[PDB]
Design a protein around this ligand. Structure first.
Ligand SMILES: [Cl-]
Ligand SMILES: [Cl-]
Ligand SMILES: [Cl-]
Lengths: 158, 161
């Protein structure tokens, strides 16, 4: 049986350049997956201030940490909101809403990833944005599927 | 922001609030903000969040109005109680329509034009469009945001009769 978490980790790491920072991110991801005690606020502040990572990468990681910690009332973060929002283009948003409509009916990781791969990186990031901003809701496995598809599209373009 | 515009927004927003002491307190805080007094947004949003009586939707609309009218947010993160109230219940049809309205509001320049176009849409679509803007997904001018707010209040008020 696929470990969702191994898979998410592999996809998210695929968009991060090699180096000490990448090793530190892998470790924090694993710590969170395994339930090792963690202040989400502290982790998000650490993430926000890392050099090297592009804003989109920080947004994707912030989304992953927020979804995986047992509990947040931490308000959603502006640095994630700005990275996932698109540049306010109605066409990406329109496509993000169309993908959301489909993801809302899904409950499995594989179903979610497959459907998500029909959309561009921009539409995928905005769909992540919809979810992060509480505009739409999906199950955790479906959110992970979307994350992986987003990373796969980013990795393939690079 | 013209006081003319602010006063119109005040009237539309107050039209969806039931009479009583709470309504008088809201009118007063709105007016204080319009004049540049008691403008700490964090305090105001925490006050709003904990008021009894007001429905979550009303709190969302007021939260959006305070956020747009204070001189600065002072880096205040956007609020969960507003985000949950202005999302059209996460319904894809409401969201789809919200995006279509947004595309039009992005070309509008006047309050009246923003309100008129917004009145063609349902309350659900309007609340989600407000959500789009509050969540930083789309951007419109302040006068256009006010037009949208007023249309939303008008649709809500009209269903109440
Ligand atoms: Cl932030
Ligand atoms: Cl809140
Ligand atoms: Cl629908």
């Amino acid at each position: 049986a696929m470990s969702l978490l191994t898979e998410v980790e592999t996809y998210v790491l695929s968009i991060i350049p090699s180096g000490p920072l990448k090793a530190e991110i892998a470790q924090r991801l694993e710590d969170v997956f395994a339930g090792k005690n963690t202040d989400l606020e502290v982790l998000m502040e650490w993430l926000k201030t890392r050099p090297i990572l592009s804003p989109l990468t920080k947004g994707i990681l912030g989304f992953v940490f927020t979804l995986t910690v047992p509990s947040e009332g931490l308000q959603r973060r502006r640095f994630v909101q700005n990275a996932l929002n698109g540049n306010g283009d109605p066409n990406n948003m329109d496509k993000a809403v169309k993908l959301y409509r489909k993801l809302k009916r899904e409950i499995t990781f594989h179903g979610a990833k497959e459907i998500s791969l029909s959309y561009s990186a921009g539409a995928l990031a905005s769909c992540m944005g919809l979810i992060y901003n509480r505009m739409g809701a999906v199950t955790t496995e479906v959110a992970f599927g979307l994350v992986c598809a987003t990373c796969e599209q980013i990795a393939d373009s690079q």
